[PDB]
Design a protein around this ligand. Structure first.
Ligand SMILES: [Mg+2]
Ligand SMILES: [Mg+2]
Ligand SMILES: [Mg+2]
Ligand SMILES: [Mg+2]
Ligand SMILES: [Mg+2]
Ligand SMILES: [Mg+2]
Ligand SMILES: [Mg+2]
Ligand SMILES: [Mg+2]
Ligand SMILES: [Mg+2]
Ligand SMILES: [Mg+2]
Ligand SMILES: [Mg+2]
Ligand SMILES: [Mg+2]
Ligand SMILES: [Mg+2]
Ligand SMILES: [Mg+2]
Ligand SMILES: [Mg+2]
Ligand SMILES: [Mg+2]
Ligand SMILES: [Mg+2]
Ligand SMILES: [Mg+2]
Ligand SMILES: [Mg+2]
Ligand SMILES: [Mg+2]
Ligand SMILES: [Mg+2]
Ligand code: NA
Ligand code: NA
Ligand code: NA
Lengths: 61, 71, 183, 141, 130
RNA sequence: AUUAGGGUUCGAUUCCGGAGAGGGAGCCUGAGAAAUAGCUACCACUUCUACGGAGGGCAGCAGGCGCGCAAAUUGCCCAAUGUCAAAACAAAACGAUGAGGCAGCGAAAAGAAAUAGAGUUGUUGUCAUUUCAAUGGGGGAUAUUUAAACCCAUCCAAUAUCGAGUAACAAUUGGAGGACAAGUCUGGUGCCAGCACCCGCGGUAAUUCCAGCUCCAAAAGCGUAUAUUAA
């Protein structure tokens, strides 16, 4: 017949449950802004001619 | 004003023509008002004549002015 | 109901939410001046926009206009007293050229760090928030305190603070109380 | 072209009044036809009762069964079709349940590949549907 | 550096005014307490003000509305010095006299008075007050 | 409110003016009312009764029932602000006042502002260590405030006053193809579930779904819907 109301939610129940891992807390407020400012403008020297990636990923497939 | 109608007994209608300014368009439009004025039997105005009127107490339902001069 | 206490907003959000040129420039200001959030920058932006708006209106009027003579001298007195401009720059045209860092430099957070009371701009903010800094012998706990040039020399450690003439702080007080009670 | 006379303000006023009706947005705001046909009657939200769960096929070139419900509004007994967002949220809705409905974001226009659906389910049994989806709350009864 | 000292209180008077209409003197009282631990009690300020102005009885000084300055070390309020104790007990508001001890006892709850008045509107003669 | 300017739009709502006290219409008194916590009648509702009768008008305050997407306490006080009045205050001797004020509730909106700061050594910066001081949240008071309380403010001895190290006192809300700041990442699903304001993604190697990780944006705020202004 014209489709099924069943199968609703199929993928959410299919997806294996991966627990969210525990990490140390991050600074909040001004400290977090200071932490981000250090990485962008103080942790490295800018090399012109190549853009800067803030979430560069390891190679795969 | 200017006399508009002279068909009532001892009463006349006058017209006050003026330009009203519309702010948005920065231009004028022609407008007029009509007033019922008591005319004493000492003036005998004609349609098209121009008169000077003065405010007085209500003399009828629509009359609030009296003819003071005819030009 | 029947309450007539005025209130108004002091900041405005940027029209374009994601501009890499503006985001990088504002992040540079946030980390250099130790600001908590972007609202502090935008609060300064609103202040700068008000003064420039008034200056532009005054420059339209002729020089002899009483509004230009009165209101024009008032704003320059404000710029000179708070250090936004310089005494040498005594024309309304220099109000138009004011920049955001100029106001940011006059903040108590920047002044304390520049004066040497704190070894970092972040040290200055926490020191001010911890009632260790006094301006003209008055404790100020507001980092956004705009310091006048006249009161710049009167900034020092608070009388009641352990860094000035006050009693001992927290860790020393509890330790001595711990040392006494442990007997 | 247009009139330019200094004493021609009446013509310019009349011209704008007549031509403002050609604007579909301006006409809709100044006419009651849209509100009379609007099931919400000009409201942002409306409460209703679920009549049945139905599956609506996505428009070409999409291929899906968008899960919707038939809702009868309490305020005016008008029947509407409302989309149920997120994955598996249809299980949170039952027959004769009290649901809060909202617009779909385009002010009465159909949204996405769903053929003619302009409403979505926002709350069910007085608790937010998205909160149930994230397990922040639990459905009473 | 710290210097352990006795906490001393200094009374400062400003905007002093004498009005014979109410038989008193009005002034703003400023209190300087650089090393005080907490707030200066109003009783202590009354004693110092009485000695400062050389009044016979300290009970004829009335103080109220003391606001501590931000950052500590200062307090400002209002003070009245009456010609005699009789004038103070005659012109001072009841709530201020209650703080000093010689105040009238509180009346019954206003709610109960409202019920009694409304109940009496039914009665005609000699029933009111039973 | 939004706007370079011209404009567009909102104004039930604090002040001024008008109107009304369920619906209508009459009227007495009075300087002033076509009054409604005044009267009379009718129509709608509605309460008590011993059945003969007698009543009621929250679009005042608080609070109920409905209605709905949608809006608080059946609280304290006349201390302030005023009104009325035969009336200063006080003395056996305290005028009323839900007008008003003060608290409760209250992420409408608005202002200020924490969630850390300095180092040591090891591995210019990060990281593992390692100390050092500081401070609130909070708990308290000779007290202060207040009509009385409650909030602020002051203080942690003045002879004599509690307290951060996973500072667990643990920040969230939406996103990461394009518009539009941020992943050729890793698993799971195969035009299904779902996403997607728009363009589009998914039919077995998904930059878009469900997840983990990482990253981005704003931040004690942040999404969504509907109006409205600019665009
Ligand atoms: Mg202190
Ligand atoms: Mg033509
Ligand atoms: Mg414009
Ligand atoms: Mg109005
Ligand atoms: Mg209405
Ligand atoms: Mg009336
Ligand atoms: Mg009613
Ligand atoms: Mg009278
Ligand atoms: Mg009436
Ligand atoms: Mg009533
Ligand atoms: Mg009636
Ligand atoms: Mg609300
Ligand atoms: Mg009163
Ligand atoms: Mg009240
Ligand atoms: Mg009230
Ligand atoms: Mg706030
Ligand atoms: Mg926290
Ligand atoms: Mg208060
Ligand atoms: Mg990008
Ligand atoms: Mg795969
Ligand atoms: Mg994959
Ligand atoms: Na009520
Ligand atoms: Na209140
Ligand atoms: Na993802």
């Amino acid at each position: 017949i014209h489709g099924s109301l069943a199968r609703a939610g199929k993928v959410k129940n299919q997806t294996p449950k991966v627990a969210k891992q525990e990490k140390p807390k991050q600074p909040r407020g001004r400290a977090l802004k200071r932490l981000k400012y250090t990485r962008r403008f103080l942790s490295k020297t800018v090399k012109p001619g190549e853009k800067v990636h803030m979430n560069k990923q390891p190679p795969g497939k | 004003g200017v006399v508009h109608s002279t068909k009532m007994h001892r009463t006349i209608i006058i017209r006050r023509n003026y330009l009203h300014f519309i702010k948005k368009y920065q231009r004028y439009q022609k407008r007029h008002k009509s007033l019922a004025v008591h005319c004493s039997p000492a003036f005998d105005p004609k349609q098209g004549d121009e008169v000077v009127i003065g405010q007085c107490r209500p003399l009828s339902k629509t009359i609030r002015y009296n003819v003071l001069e005819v030009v | 109901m029947r309450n007539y206490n005025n209130f108004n907003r002091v900041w405005k959000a940027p029209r374009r939410p994601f501009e890499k040129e503006r985001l990088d420039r504002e992040m540079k200001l946030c980390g250099q001046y130790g600001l908590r959030c972007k609202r502090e920058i935008w609060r300064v932006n609103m202040t700068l926009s008000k003064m420039r708006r008034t200056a532009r209106l005054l420059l339209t009027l002729p020089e002899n206009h009483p509004r230009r003579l009165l209101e024009g001298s008032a704003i320059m007195r404000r710029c000179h007293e708070y250090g936004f401009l310089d005494e040498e720059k005594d024309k309304l045209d220099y109000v138009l050229s004011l920049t955001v860092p100029d106001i940011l430099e006059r903040r108590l957070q920047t002044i304390v760090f520049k004066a040497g009371l704190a070894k970092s701009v972040h040290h200055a903010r926490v020191l001010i928030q911890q009632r260790h800094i006094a301006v003209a012998k008055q404790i100020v706990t507001i980092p956004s305190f705009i310091v006048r040039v006249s009161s710049e020399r009167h900034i020092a450690f608070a009388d009641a603070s352990p860094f000035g003439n006050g009693r001992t702080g927290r860790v020393k007080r509890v330790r001595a109380k711990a040392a006494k009670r442990h007997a | 072209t247009k009139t330019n006379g200094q004493n021609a303000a009446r013509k310019l006023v009349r011209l704008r009044c007549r031509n403002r009706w050609a604007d579909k947005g301006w006409k809709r705001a100044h006419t009651f036809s849209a509100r009379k046909a609007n099931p919400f009657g000009g409201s942002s939200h409306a409460k209703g009762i679920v009549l049945e769960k139905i599956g609506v096929g996505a428009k070409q070139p999409n291929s899906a069964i968008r899960k919707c419900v038939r809702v009868q509004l309490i305020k005016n007994d008008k029947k509407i079709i409302a989309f149920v967002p997120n994955d598996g949220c249809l299980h949170f809705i039952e027959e004769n349940d009290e649901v809060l409905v909202s617009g779909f974001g385009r002010s009465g226009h159909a949204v996405g590949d769903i053929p003619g659906v302009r409403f979505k389910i926002v709350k069910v049994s007085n608790v937010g549907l998205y909160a149930l989806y994230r397990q922040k709350k639990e459905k009473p009864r | 550096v710290f210097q352990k000292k006795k906490a001393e209180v200094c009374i400062r008077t400003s905007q002093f005014k004498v009005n014979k209409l109410l038989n008193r003197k009005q002034f703003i009282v400023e209190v300087n307490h650089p090393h005080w631990c907490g707030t200066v009690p109003t009783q202590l300020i009354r004693k110092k003000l009485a000695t400062l102005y050389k009044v016979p009885d300290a009970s004829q000084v009335s103080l109220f509305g003391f606001k501590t300055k931000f950052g500590g070390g200062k307090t400002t309020g209002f003070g009245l010095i009456y010609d005699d104790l009789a004038s103070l007990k005659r012109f001072e508001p009841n709530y201020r006299k209650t703080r000093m001890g010689f105040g009238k006892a509180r009346l019954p709850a206003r709610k109960s008075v409202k019920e009694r008045r409304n109940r009496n509107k039914k009665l005609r003669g000699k029933a009111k007050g039973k």
